[PDB]
Amino acid sequence: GIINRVVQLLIISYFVGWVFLHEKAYQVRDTAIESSVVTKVKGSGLYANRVMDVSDYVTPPQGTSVFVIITKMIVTENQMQGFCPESEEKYRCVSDSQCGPERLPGGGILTGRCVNYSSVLRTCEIQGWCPTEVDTVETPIMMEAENFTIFIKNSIRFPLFNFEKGNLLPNLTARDMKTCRFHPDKDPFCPILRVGDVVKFAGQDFAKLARTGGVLGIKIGWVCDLDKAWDQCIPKYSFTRLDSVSEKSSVSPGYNFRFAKYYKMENGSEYRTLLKAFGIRFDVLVYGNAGKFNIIPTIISSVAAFTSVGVGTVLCDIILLNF
Amino acid sequence: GIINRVVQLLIISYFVGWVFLHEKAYQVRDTAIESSVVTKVKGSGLYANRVMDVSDYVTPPQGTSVFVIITKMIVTENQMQGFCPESEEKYRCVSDSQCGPERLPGGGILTGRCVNYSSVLRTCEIQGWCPTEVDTVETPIMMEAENFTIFIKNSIRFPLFNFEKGNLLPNLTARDMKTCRFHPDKDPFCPILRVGDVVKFAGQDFAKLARTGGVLGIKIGWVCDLDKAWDQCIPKYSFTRLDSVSEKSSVSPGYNFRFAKYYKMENGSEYRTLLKAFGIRFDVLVYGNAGKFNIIPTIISSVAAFTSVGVGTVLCDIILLNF
Amino acid sequence: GIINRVVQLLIISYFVGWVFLHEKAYQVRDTAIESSVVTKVKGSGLYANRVMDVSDYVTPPQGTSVFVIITKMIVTENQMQGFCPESEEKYRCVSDSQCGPERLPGGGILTGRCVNYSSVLRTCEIQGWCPTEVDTVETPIMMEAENFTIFIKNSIRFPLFNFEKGNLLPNLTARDMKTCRFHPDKDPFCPILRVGDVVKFAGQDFAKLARTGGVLGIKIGWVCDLDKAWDQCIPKYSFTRLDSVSEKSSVSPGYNFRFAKYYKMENGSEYRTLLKAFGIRFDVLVYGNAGKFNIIPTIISSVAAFTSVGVGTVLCDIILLNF
């Protein structure tokens, strides 16, 4: 008999408490958040006893939500089209018959010939950009990169509610930019993030990550209850490493890619500088949903709540009557 | 007593009208729209008394759904690695003690020394790419850019219904491309959009936007009722400015980025041309959902409608009986 | 009378069979899948009797989920700023009055003058990068591209369940990479995909696709029932052509774009090599949802199932009683 009143309290609390209140059934929700992100990196480093600025280590440069900060390089200066032996021992050859299709991808096409790369070693000859890259000793990382800064201008808009806000507040001043200390909880509206800080929030050691290369994700969540104050709608920053496989795998441990700088002589012959770039890739991911009170969902939701509590008490009353 | 019939009409109309008809409950919905976008910009401009074509002002060039049309530039010709004084007055120095870590990011690393940039001004010395960029007088914009054209090939497919359509209709002809006048309502299937037109649909003044740089969004919505004719499935174009913060903020008012063109001498020394690019970034965002009649959701939906109207009339009859 | 028991079996089977079991109502679902993709292409080709490696034909190079493999080129060597006649016959001119605004976009700005491109043909003069591109005879494709390989490191994580898996399994070895044969069904965990294979899975002929250029989509779906074994969570590969309009349209049949390589003389004058690139663009699209048993949705779902079967038998009993 008392279980009837208990079931009544559980139905009333669930349908009018969790379902109606905690789940904000009284609210209209806009999930089609409109976002824009623009980035700008600042910092200088020493690599190969040359200074490197944003135009040197950031790629691509258009300042989108995805960019790489190069932290390590294998530089192959002044390549030219020709014939030459492969560098890595993986291509060791003793007989021209060993230079066949079974060989792994290399600097160029295989001539089928076999040449002496050094007095000690002989490898397969190739036609392509010469000489081939040599990966014998590890190259250093750009330590200063740990201090580079990432400027994030993130604009968001829930169009359903014609609501627009950004991580740059309207009262932001040049002094603020010069002196604010970003923190996900303490100061979410500082547009400057320290690269080393982002790396550590992601649970990574800058030395290792910069040695191997990797992909970090900067997630910005705008979950805003537009019923509350405009100043309560704040961004929630989360950080992670997206190439999680890389750490668990020995075959491919990081992130790197190759690109070239192309030159011509007055003579007119082409020559290029090859670059194997290791770096940290930053992905800025913006998500959000908004909700504001609307009478319609309050009517439908409350009516559904009364029909739900009524159906509940009715079914519990019947099941109690028969048993 | 009459309120019973009134509640019956509201239940029947809601559950069989809005819920069943207006909300197309009889329809199966495909929301996993598959989209592809390819772009090509055309136009030429005069900047620095040089002609600039797509290969000069568009970046990146692969013709994806995101590209920049550069409208303004600060060009720093023939930089070389070395030592030189900072250009901007923000780095004004009188004592070598003022050249310390508290200085903002600059063209290069700080030597700690202090040098005379000009007879009137002395600033901190740096090691890096020299000379530093000078932002003393504003550079002009490429006015002709207002007339550039954006060619958008947008392919979409709802795989659930094996339905494929694109903004390029199959009966599109070379004359059409040469002469069609795009309009979101009047002619949605013209693949050529005037840059100035896109800027104005976004509610922007090309002169100012091209002066500051900005991000414009071109939204293409494919909301198609596959029950109706194939020719009723048309794209809905919307335009906006995505970096909405930029206009409300004095600290960062637009969109720009820096990149360099790299050269070598026959002598073999590296030198580069630095570029501070202001431009309009275009983001083509494609969204859509499709629906087609399927008997299953018609059965489940109609049965739910009858159970709903029945439960409604039952509860209203009981509440009327007790009170 | 028997239809009462029939309706009872249909209600019990639907609400406790399809709705509760097949639809995994007992499961909590994570749809906010977190994905990261990194790519690396390998292969060499012969084009213009030059060898071309990843740094030559892949763009952009940062190894993101979207990249192009260039398969065809129209190369315009050593352009310089100046005046010259238009190449294509579309610009045929006989009178300087015909060189007006009605002309289509061209290599540069129009001088209004008219010049002889050849003894046989006269066209409009332009100021810009000279000479203009000549598209008279078709250029060959890089046949070897059919054998290039795409290395895909895809990391995914459902954070709700703190679940992380990737297409590179932890027991992957160098021999595996050197010898595994990717197949969507037979071997989903081989990170190496043959370009020609991807083209054919997409239902395309490499010769034609490489002639016109196109966009291929590589969809990777992680639909995982975390109740089952960790080894049951496997990626589902799908392949398609995303620019479906291109094949059905005569006006624009493929995918290509233009970019330039910039050079300077010791003299200091700028000159560039123009490139019209035809290639296959690969879009790696990752989707997924996960589900794991949770007691809460089992309670709510089972209670909803009993209330549903009860309401069903009640309404069928009443409708049977009155009629």
Ligand SMILES: CSc1nc(N)c2ncn([C@@H]3O[C@H](COP(=O)(O)OP(=O)(O)OP(=O)(O)O)[C@@H](O)[C@H]3O)c2n1
């Ligand atoms: C044997 S066919 C093939 N095709 C690819 N596209 C491809 N991309 C990467 N790999 C190989 O797969 C391994 C993992 O790739 P990785 O993380 O880039 O390591 P890595 O920097 O030493 O790669 P490389 O120096 O050899 O270019 C590595 O041994 C690399 O050589 C690839 N192998």
Ligand SMILES: CSc1nc(N)c2ncn([C@@H]3O[C@H](COP(=O)(O)OP(=O)(O)OP(=O)(O)O)[C@@H](O)[C@H]3O)c2n1
């Ligand atoms: C003080 S530490 C730091 N780190 C960044 N990554 C960064 N990116 C941009 N800023 C600064 O924040 C301001 C807004 O950036 P902006 O919209 O790019 O203006 P701007 O074009 O004058 O920026 P710059 O010329 O200084 O490169 C501006 O004063 C710029 O110098 C940045 N400051």
Ligand SMILES: CSc1nc(N)c2ncn([C@@H]3O[C@H](COP(=O)(O)OP(=O)(O)OP(=O)(O)O)[C@@H](O)[C@H]3O)c2n1
């Ligand atoms: C007449 S105004 C205009 N503006 C564009 N942005 C634009 N982009 C492409 N087109 C034209 O529309 C046609 C289809 O474009 P397409 O697939 O790139 O063919 P295509 O390679 O011959 O284009 P082009 O060689 O002329 O650059 C083609 O004739 C091209 O010239 C464009 N036309």
Ligand SMILES: *[C@@H]1O[C@H](CO)[C@@H](O)[C@H](O)[C@H]1NC(C)=O
């Ligand atoms: C970062 O900069 C601070 C000065 O602001 C300096 O003390 C520190 O050594 C720098 N870190 C690295 C890794 O260079």
Ligand SMILES: *[C@@H]1O[C@H](CO)[C@@H](O)[C@H](O)[C@H]1NC(C)=O
């Ligand atoms: C700037 O405006 C925000 C808006 O809520 C406010 O929280 C903050 O205190 C303001 N800062 C200053 C310095 O006025």
Ligand SMILES: *[C@@H]1O[C@H](CO)[C@@H](O)[C@H](O)[C@H]1NC(C)=O
């Ligand atoms: C350019 O110079 C190099 C060496 O200086 C030479 O091998 C090459 O043949 C020259 N180019 C031409 C077209 O002769």
Ligand SMILES: *[C@@H]1O[C@H](CO)[C@@H](O)[C@H](O)[C@H]1NC(C)=O
């Ligand atoms: C755009 O082109 C038209 C001719 O089609 C010309 O009249 C107009 O002046 C141009 N606009 C600009 C800003 O150059």
Ligand SMILES: *[C@@H]1O[C@H](CO)[C@@H](O)[C@H](O)[C@H]1NC(C)=O
């Ligand atoms: C091209 O086909 C579409 C398909 O509905 C049609 O609306 C349009 O009128 C056609 N145009 C011509 C010129 O036939």
Ligand SMILES: *[C@@H]1O[C@H](CO)[C@@H](O)[C@H](O)[C@H]1NC(C)=O
């Ligand atoms: C290249 O020339 C410049 C000036 O012409 C000179 O400063 C530099 O030392 C030269 N390069 C080398 C490697 O000597």
Ligand SMILES: *[C@@H]1O[C@H](CO)[C@@H](O)[C@H](O)[C@H]1NC(C)=O
């Ligand atoms: C691809 O490589 C194989 C050898 O592994 C060779 O037999 C075949 O001819 C190549 N295909 C093309 C199109 O070159």
Ligand SMILES: *[C@@H]1O[C@H](CO)[C@@H](O)[C@H](O)[C@H]1NC(C)=O
């Ligand atoms: C590697 O681990 C996976 C995990 O399920 C397993 O299926 C596969 O058989 C293992 N391969 C080897 C060679 O142990």
Ligand SMILES: *[C@@H]1O[C@H](CO)[C@@H](O)[C@H](O)[C@H]1NC(C)=O
């Ligand atoms: C560079 O050389 C070309 C031809 O060799 C000449 O036309 C041009 O005027 C030179 N540059 C300058 C600045 O004189």
Ligand code: NA
């Ligand atoms: Na290697």
Ligand code: NA
């Ligand atoms: Na500045």
Ligand code: NA
């Ligand atoms: Na053409």
